[PDB]
Design an enzyme around this catalytic site. Sequence first.
Site, PDB file in Angstrom:
ATOM      1  N   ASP A   1       8.789  24.805  47.531  1.00 38.49           N
ATOM      2  CA  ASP A   1       8.760  23.999  46.594  1.00 38.49           C
ATOM      3  C   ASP A   1       7.981  24.388  45.452  1.00 38.49           C
ATOM      4  O   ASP A   1       8.080  23.946  44.301  1.00 38.49           O
ATOM      5  CB  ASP A   1       8.453  22.512  47.225  1.00 38.49           C
ATOM      6  CG  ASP A   1       9.532  22.045  48.162  1.00 38.49           C
ATOM      7  OD1 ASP A   1      10.577  22.360  47.901  1.00 38.49           O
ATOM      8  OD2 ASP A   1       8.802  21.131  48.984  1.00 38.49           O
TER       9      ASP A   1
ATOM     10  N   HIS B   1      -3.450  29.892  50.098  1.00 35.75           N
ATOM     11  CA  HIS B   1      -2.876  28.277  49.971  1.00 35.75           C
ATOM     12  C   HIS B   1      -2.959  27.638  51.186  1.00 35.75           C
ATOM     13  O   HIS B   1      -2.719  26.331  51.561  1.00 35.75           O
ATOM     14  CB  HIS B   1      -1.326  28.220  49.490  1.00 35.75           C
ATOM     15  CG  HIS B   1      -1.412  27.952  48.136  1.00 35.75           C
ATOM     16  ND1 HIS B   1      -1.481  26.567  47.604  1.00 35.75           N
ATOM     17  CD2 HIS B   1      -1.597  28.605  46.836  1.00 35.75           C
ATOM     18  CE1 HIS B   1      -1.677  26.448  46.319  1.00 35.75           C
ATOM     19  NE2 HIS B   1      -1.730  27.605  45.895  1.00 35.75           N
TER      20      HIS B   1
ATOM     21  N   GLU C   1      16.614  17.432  49.359  1.00 37.23           N
ATOM     22  CA  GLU C   1      15.251  17.029  49.768  1.00 37.23           C
ATOM     23  C   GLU C   1      15.211  15.436  49.840  1.00 37.23           C
ATOM     24  O   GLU C   1      16.409  15.034  49.474  1.00 37.23           O
ATOM     25  CB  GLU C   1      14.158  17.556  49.211  1.00 37.23           C
ATOM     26  CG  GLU C   1      13.716  19.166  49.246  1.00 37.23           C
ATOM     27  CD  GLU C   1      12.687  19.538  49.121  1.00 37.23           C
ATOM     28  OE1 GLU C   1      12.425  20.834  49.151  1.00 37.23           O
ATOM     29  OE2 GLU C   1      11.484  19.037  48.665  1.00 37.23           O
TER      30      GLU C   1
END
EC number: 1.5.99.12
Length: 496
Positions: free
Chosen positions: A137, A73, A250
């Site tokens: 997340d 990632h 958030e």
Amino acid sequence: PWPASLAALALDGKLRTDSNATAAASTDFGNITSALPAAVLYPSSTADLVALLSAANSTPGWPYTIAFRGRGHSLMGQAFAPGGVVVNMASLGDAAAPPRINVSADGRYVDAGGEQVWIDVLRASLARGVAPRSWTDYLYLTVGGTLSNAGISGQAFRHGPQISNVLEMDVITGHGEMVTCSKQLNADLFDAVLGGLGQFGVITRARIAVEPAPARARWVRLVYTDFAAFSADQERLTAPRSFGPMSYVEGSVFVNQSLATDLANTGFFTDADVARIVALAGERNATTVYSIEATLNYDNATAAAAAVDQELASVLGTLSYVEGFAFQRDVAYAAFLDRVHGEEVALNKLGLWRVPHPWLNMFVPRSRIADFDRGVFKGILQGTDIVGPLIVYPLNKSMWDDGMSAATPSEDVFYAVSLLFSSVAPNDLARLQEQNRRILRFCDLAGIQYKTYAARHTDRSDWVRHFGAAKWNRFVEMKNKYDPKRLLSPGQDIFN
Ligand SMILES: *Cc1cc2c(cc1C)nc1c(=O)[nH]c(=O)nc-1n2C[C@H](O)[C@H](O)[C@H](O)COP(=O)(O)OP(=O)(O)OC[C@H]1O[C@@H](n2cnc3c(N)ncnc32)[C@H](O)[C@@H]1O
Ligand SMILES: *[C@@H]1O[C@H](CO)[C@@H](O[C@@H]2O[C@H](CO)[C@@H](O)[C@H](O)[C@H]2NC(C)=O)[C@H](O)[C@H]1NC(C)=O
Ligand SMILES: *[C@@H]1O[C@H](CO)[C@@H](O[C@@H]2O[C@H](CO)[C@@H](O)[C@H](O)[C@H]2NC(C)=O)[C@H](O)[C@H]1NC(C)=O
Ligand SMILES: *[C@@H]1O[C@H](CO)[C@@H](O[C@H]2O[C@H](CO)[C@@H](O)[C@H](O)[C@H]2NC(C)=O)[C@H](O)[C@H]1NC(C)=O
Ligand SMILES: O=C(NCc1ccccc1)Nc1ccnc(Cl)c1
Ligand SMILES: *[C@@H]1O[C@H](CO)[C@@H](O)[C@H](O)[C@H]1NC(C)=O
Ligand SMILES: *[C@@H]1O[C@H](CO)[C@@H](O)[C@H](O)[C@H]1NC(C)=O
């Protein structure tokens, strides 16, 4: 000459060089940079990792840099091993046994192989009624990968990043030595590796702190047109009292030009909610809209629901979002945590996932977040079509261990700012990359002391400024102790 154990890996077909293998380990999520390794290692056990690393350490002139690919990632090749060896960590978990994830008997922690992805850590934890307390997340990242960065989400303000929720780890240093570390044992390695960007060794096991798993999450979004009120409330919700009742906090920024589209893409707002927010924006003549996203975790208790309503009503009463612009959803805890997975699937089938991701992730000190808002959200980003969320939320430095490798701003409160730009349009990547340089330049000129996150620098002076001179020297001291040959994770471009 090849060491016996190293040759054995070749014989067993674990050490591959076929184009299919090297190709798969030459690209990452960033889809911006690529680098073919000379070979890919598919370890079946941590012993295979020792072999390779031991070989490199004892073999004079060893020319093969080594990277540890979690799920790739990384955005800019941090997991590549140009002309070297890429370790396919996921292979450590192919054996149906022994398990790679074990929830402790006392339920106080969960042991997870470094190659394991968080979604699996979650499922294995929920099976035992527990769950990590600090997340990311997106859950399809490896334990070792997020721990080499920090691992942040809306829980970090009160539990700190994932690196602040690790009791101990098994690490194989650049010397090929298996070492178990923690704050009590080999603390020097423990601290270096956390936020260490895979520079000191590979994490084969991380002891992750857990808490009793809540059953559901009351999920809310509050809308603002005033950044001052938005940031003030995010700070109020995450300020130490011990913390408020919110389990996650958030925030999102919606630029006016693509307001309706981005609000709809949240997957949270209904078209009716969108219409109301677009109208509000027009009424206030706002070029930007802000939304706080917060959750209140709770269990299935019979009175839970009613208690949640009261707690939430109480908290919301302390806030200043636009009257009547509070939006609630109520879902299973796991559904909330894995909320992004659904977005990936959709985007991928649409061919919008495997595209360039010129993401800009940084930490901005609280004292300059309003300036950042003016220069970036109300400035640089204005007049553009934004595809991808713009995430902004406060973090408490008290929950970060400066002794570890991860770098953060010096202020008590700083914001995680994540602009997840997708180069969806044809060759729109160049513009986005230029835009990010412009954002960083804007910050440098305004004197904003930010820290980038999950980003690699190509200039030594930048890495020194990133860590800070003293902390940099410390990083070097540890590098000289755990990877003197400068072979691990060359993709970070720190010592390579
Ligand atoms: C693709 C992505 C990433 C991401 C995210 C959403 C998406 C769609 N959301 C995040 C979030 O909400 N919060 C957060 O803190 N990070 C988030 N990320 C970024 C992610 O943390 C990084 O991409 C990270 O690199 C982990 O990803 P992955 O597990 O896939 O690791 P890699 O990219 O393959 O490697 C990163 C570096 O770490 C070294 N590495 C990897 N595993 C190990 C072990 N086990 N031990 C030591 N080093 C390790 C690599 O060598 C590389 O340098
Ligand atoms: C999870 O727990 C199992 C215990 O059942 C551990 O399995 C042992 O692992 C070692 C080395 O990995 C082997 O030498 C043993 O033979 C295994 N025993 C069993 C029961 O299979 C496993 O290592 C643990 N993994 C974690 C998460 O640390
Ligand atoms: C927010 O963006 C919208 C566009 O989505 C702007 O509205 C447009 O304004 C121009 C100029 O009057 C009109 O020609 C367009 O028809 C409008 N779009 C529609 C149909 O809504 C709006 O001005 C922007 N607001 C701010 C404060 O920048
Ligand atoms: C509505 O918001 C806009 C944007 O914040 C205000 O800005 C416009 O007017 C300014 C004053 O002359 C100009 O400097 C801006 O360039 C112009 N916006 C753009 C870029 O087109 C606008 O004044 C606000 N409306 C009012 C007058 O209340
Ligand atoms: O990707 C993130 N969220 C994915 C997401 C969240 C909400 C909606 C859609 C996508 N956040 C994030 C944070 C720090 N570093 C990186 Cl690389 C990414
Ligand atoms: C980006 O992804 C596309 C589609 O999978 C692929 O063809 C291309 O080679 C990738 N480029 C890089 C730099 O990874
Ligand atoms: C919460 O309640 C649901 C439905 O009653 C149940 O399926 C779930 O297992 C419960 N959570 C717990 C305590 O595991």
